Write an enzyme that holds these catalytic residues in place. Structure first.
Site, short mmCIF file in Angstrom:
data_model
loop_
_atom_site.label_atom_id
_atom_site.label_comp_id
_atom_site.label_asym_id
_atom_site.label_seq_id
_atom_site.Cartn_x
_atom_site.Cartn_y
_atom_site.Cartn_z
N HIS A 155 -16.38 17.95 -4.12
CA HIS A 155 -15.22 17.60 -3.31
C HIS A 155 -15.26 16.14 -2.85
O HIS A 155 -14.20 15.55 -2.64
CB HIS A 155 -15.12 18.57 -2.12
CG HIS A 155 -14.69 19.94 -2.53
ND1 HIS A 155 -13.63 20.59 -1.94
CD2 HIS A 155 -15.12 20.74 -3.54
CE1 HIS A 155 -13.47 21.77 -2.53
NE2 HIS A 155 -14.34 21.88 -3.50
N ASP A 205 -18.40 8.63 -2.88
CA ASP A 205 -18.49 7.48 -1.94
C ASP A 205 -18.73 7.87 -0.50
O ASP A 205 -18.70 7.03 0.38
CB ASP A 205 -17.20 6.64 -2.02
CG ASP A 205 -15.95 7.41 -1.63
OD1 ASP A 205 -15.98 8.68 -1.40
OD2 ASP A 205 -14.86 6.81 -1.52
N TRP A 229 -19.04 22.84 -18.49
CA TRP A 229 -20.42 22.54 -18.14
C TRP A 229 -20.64 22.41 -16.63
O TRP A 229 -21.64 22.93 -16.09
CB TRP A 229 -20.89 21.27 -18.85
CG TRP A 229 -20.79 21.34 -20.37
CD1 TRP A 229 -20.72 22.47 -21.14
CD2 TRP A 229 -20.74 20.23 -21.26
NE1 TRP A 229 -20.58 22.11 -22.47
CE2 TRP A 229 -20.60 20.74 -22.57
CE3 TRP A 229 -20.75 18.85 -21.07
CZ2 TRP A 229 -20.50 19.91 -23.70
CZ3 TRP A 229 -20.66 18.00 -22.20
CH2 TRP A 229 -20.54 18.55 -23.50
N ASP A 254 -28.49 30.36 -13.62
CA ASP A 254 -28.61 31.07 -14.89
C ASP A 254 -27.24 31.29 -15.52
O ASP A 254 -26.19 30.87 -14.99
CB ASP A 254 -29.35 32.40 -14.67
CG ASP A 254 -28.68 33.32 -13.67
OD1 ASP A 254 -27.51 33.03 -13.22
OD2 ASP A 254 -29.25 34.37 -13.29
CA LIG Z 1 -26.61 32.89 -10.93
CA LIG Z 2 -14.92 10.77 -2.03
#
Ligand SMILES: [Ca+2]
Ligand SMILES: [Ca+2]
Ligand code: HEM
Ligand SMILES: C[As](C)(=O)[O-]
Ligand SMILES: [Mn+2]
Ligand SMILES: [Zn+2]
Ligand SMILES: [Zn+2]
Ligand SMILES: [Zn+2]
Ligand SMILES: [Zn+2]
Ligand SMILES: [Zn+2]
Ligand SMILES: [Zn+2]
Ligand SMILES: [Zn+2]
Ligand SMILES: [Zn+2]
EC number: 1.11.1.16
Length: 319
Positions: free
Chosen positions: A47, A62, A164, A194
């Site tokens: 976030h 940042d 990913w 996992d």
């Molecule tokens: Ca897990």
């Molecule tokens: Ca930021």
């Protein structure tokens, strides 16, 4: 280089991190465990970092979500994030590193406590934040796949990189999606990094673990697990389903791609060449204990296979 307490690190500038490491391991992570504050700190890294749009602004990773917390924590997509921001703020005040560095450091340290986990590359030296993120930059669980992939793509991530990154949901829960059942995890192993999340999101939904009409929630296969609509769709949509399935029982790929893509995310808005590599301060993660499996009583017929090119792998079930 050798630090004042005998610990070593490649670059001497990294020595300042060692007292910060010890403080957060005990006092944010409950004694170096893969619990609630690890999960919330990892959500915070995203976030903070995804507040980054070439068109609309925001400085990426940042520390803006701490520095401008009054603004950012009130954005709808940031529901529930105020708790981890308030927990992290005193550490940033006490120690001599920037909020942006602290958020990425805490996220990397936390992940390293999780069995199966990785050491995310960590770089030191981000300046203090100079703008709040715009609203409408953090993906929401009721957003479409097209929306999510366009937003992530705007920040620099391809569709495979989104999959990913969502390995994060293997160590994760929801508090605000269904507030009747706060703390309900996205997989059956929220303290293990996992492939269970990529398995369990592929199962046919059966039930709502709390109430039945929450925005952004899909049916879950298991009592005690919650499923996001965005994860339901990403596991099934033709743009992402093949990559999603490729993560199942593929722990080395989960590890390699999550670490690399997290480093890219942690550097949004930054220039690695201007920072110092302090990756070796992050602890060595424990190994998985630990095998991919279907839940007890389930079989391969319970999998909604969504990759035309490759049959879903033959897993066994817990006894
Ligand atoms: Ca897990
Ligand atoms: Ca930021
Ligand atoms: C790609 C689109 C994504 C969507 C739509 C999404 C959505 C969500 C939602 C709705 C929650 C639960 C918030 C709550 O109700 O408490 C959550 C939690 C979480 N997210 Fe994701 N997320 C996305 C990507 C990511 C990424 C890239 C990361 C990587 C850091 C991440 C890490 C986490 C973690 C670790 C939690 C658990 C927080 C906790 O246990 O309190 N998410 N996400
Ligand atoms: C454009 As949006 C990330 O608030 O659905
Ligand atoms: Mn939580
Ligand atoms: Zn705790
Ligand atoms: Zn200090
Ligand atoms: Zn400072
Ligand atoms: Zn929006
Ligand atoms: Zn919207
Ligand atoms: Zn939205
Ligand atoms: Zn689609
Ligand atoms: Zn199990």
């Amino acid at each position: 280089a050798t630090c004042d307490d005998g610990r070593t690190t490649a670059n001497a500038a990294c020595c300042i991190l060692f007292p910060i490491l010890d403080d957060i391991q005990e006092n944010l992570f409950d004694g170096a465990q893969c619990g609630e504050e690890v999960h919330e700190s990892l959500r915070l890294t995203f976030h903070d970092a995804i507040g980054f749009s070439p068109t609309l602004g925001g400085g990426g990773a940042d520390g803006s979500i701490i520095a401008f917390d009054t603004i950012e924590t009130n954005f709808p997509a940031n529901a529930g994030i105020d708790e981890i921001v308030s927990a992290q703020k005193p550490f940033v005040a006490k120690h001599n590193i920037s909020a942006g560095d602290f958020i990425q450091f805490a996220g990397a340290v936390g992940v390293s406590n999780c069995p199966g986990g990785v050491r995310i590359p960590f770089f030191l030296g981000r300046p203090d934040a100079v703008a709040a993120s715009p609203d409408h930059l953090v993906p929401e669980p009721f957003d479409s796949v097209d929306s999510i992939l366009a937003r992530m793509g705007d920040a620099g991530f391809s569709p495979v990189e989104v999959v990913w990154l969502l390995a994060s949901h293997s160590i994760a829960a929801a508090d605000k999606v269904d507030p009747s059942i706060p703390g309900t995890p996205f997989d059956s192993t929220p303290e293990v990094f996992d492939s269970q999340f990529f398995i369990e999101t592929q199962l046919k939904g059966r039930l709502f673990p709390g109430t039945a009409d929450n925005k952004g929630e899909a049916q879950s296969p298991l009592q005690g697990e919650i499923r996001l609509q965005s994860d339901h769709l990403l596991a099934r949509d033709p743009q992402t389903a093949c990559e999603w399935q490729s993560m199942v029982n593929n722990q080395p790929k989960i590890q390699n791609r999550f670490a690399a893509t997290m480093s890219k995310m942690a550097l949004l808005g930054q220039d690695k060449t201007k920072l110092i590599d302090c990756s070796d301060v992050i602890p060595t993660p424990p190994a998985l204990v630990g095998a991919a499996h279907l839940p007890a009583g389930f079989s391969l017929s319970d999998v909604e296979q969504a990759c035309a090119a490759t049959p879903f792998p033959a897993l066994t079930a817990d006894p």
